[PDB]
Amino acid sequence: HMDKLKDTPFMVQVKLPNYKDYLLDNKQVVLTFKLVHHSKKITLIGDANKILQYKNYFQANGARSDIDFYLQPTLNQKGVVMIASNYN
Amino acid sequence: QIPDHKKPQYASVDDTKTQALFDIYDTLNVNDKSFGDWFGNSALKDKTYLYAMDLLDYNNYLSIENPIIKTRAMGTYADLIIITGSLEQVNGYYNILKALNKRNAKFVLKINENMPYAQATFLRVPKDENKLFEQQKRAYFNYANDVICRPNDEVCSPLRD
């Protein structure tokens, strides 16, 4: 991650998962966060349950109450598809 | 929910206006904008984009989002990285973080075979000059032990050899 707050000193501790899990999923975790952090429209397509859970985690107790979420319940579909878009 | 001394805190490390972030207890949430835009770049902030992806399984994602995002931001820029835990784990993360780090950090591996998960400690210092560097590092580790850490807080054990 690369910000104009990287002039700033820090001292941070992190409780890590199993590094094998990090290796396995870090690239995809970064996408997800990168895409919801910056996006203005998120669309979630998947099981009616799973997409409601993600919409709520993503909304962060209203730290992202400015994102426009659009849910599309499905049935015969395993997984959740996110579509993020941004614009100036 | 989070005890007040465990909340992440800024602290004036000098007569500079630039304060330093102390998250000794791993409680800075990544989605939290309070302390500034540490995580997430501005190379996407207003770029027009449209992307489609398969989300990780939700429970799995929840339990690794904060460590993975925080590690990636902090560990990229640190000058000292300590990895504490089993031999199998500190080794695994030394290779992960040597790769990630863009500021030639020094690595210290502290072996603790009772720790079921490893623990990384990320220090970045402001701005013969090698002697200054060492003294700065000693003052941050003192400010964390004396000021921030409670005597029996166990997260703090890799800060106090």
* DSSP one-letter string for A6-31: TTS-EEEEEE---HHHHHHHHHHHHH
Q: Has residue A32 been placed in a domain?
A: yes
Domain count, chain A: 1
Q: Has residue A3 been placed in a domain?
A: no
State which residues form the domain around A64: 19-85
Q: Experimentally, how was this structure solved?
A: X-ray
Domain count, chain B: 1
Q: Could you tell me how many residues make up chain B?
A: 161
What is the three-class DSSP state of B112?
coil
CB pairs under 8 A between A and B: 210
- Contacts for B95 with CB less than 8 Å, ≥ 6 apart: none
State which residues form the domain around B53: 4-159
Determine what percent of chain A falls in helix, strand and coil, rounding each to the nearest 5.
40, 30, 30
Q: Has residue A48 been placed in a domain?
A: yes
Q: Has residue A49 been placed in a domain?
A: yes
- Dihedrals phi, psi of B139, to nearest 5 degrees: -80, -35
Inter-residue contact A34 to A82 (CB < 8 Å): no
CB atoms within 10 A of CB A29: 21
CB–CB contact B23 A10 (8 Å): yes
- Dihedrals phi, psi of B155, to nearest 5 degrees: -60, -25
Q: Identify which of B97, B89, B153 has the alpha carbon closest to the alpha carbon of residue B116.
A: B89
Q: Has residue A14 been placed in a domain?
A: no
Q: How far is it, in rounded angstroms, from Cα B5 to Cα B44?
A: 34
Q: Which of residues 138-157 of B touch A (CB under 8 A)?
A: 140, 144, 155
CB–CB contact A37 B40 (8 Å): yes
Q: Has residue A65 been placed in a domain?
A: yes
Q: Is A18's Cβ below 8 Å from some Cβ in B?
A: yes
Q: How far is it, in rounded angstroms, from Cα B3 to Cα A12?
A: 17
B28 → closest Cβ in A2, A12, A39:
A12
Q: Has residue A46 been placed in a domain?
A: yes
- Contacts for B138 with CB less than 8 Å, ≥ 6 apart: none
Q: Is A27's Cβ below 8 Å from some Cβ in B?
A: no
Q: Which of residues 59-88 of A touch B (CB under 8 A)?
A: 60, 63-64, 79-88
Q: Has residue A24 been placed in a domain?
A: yes
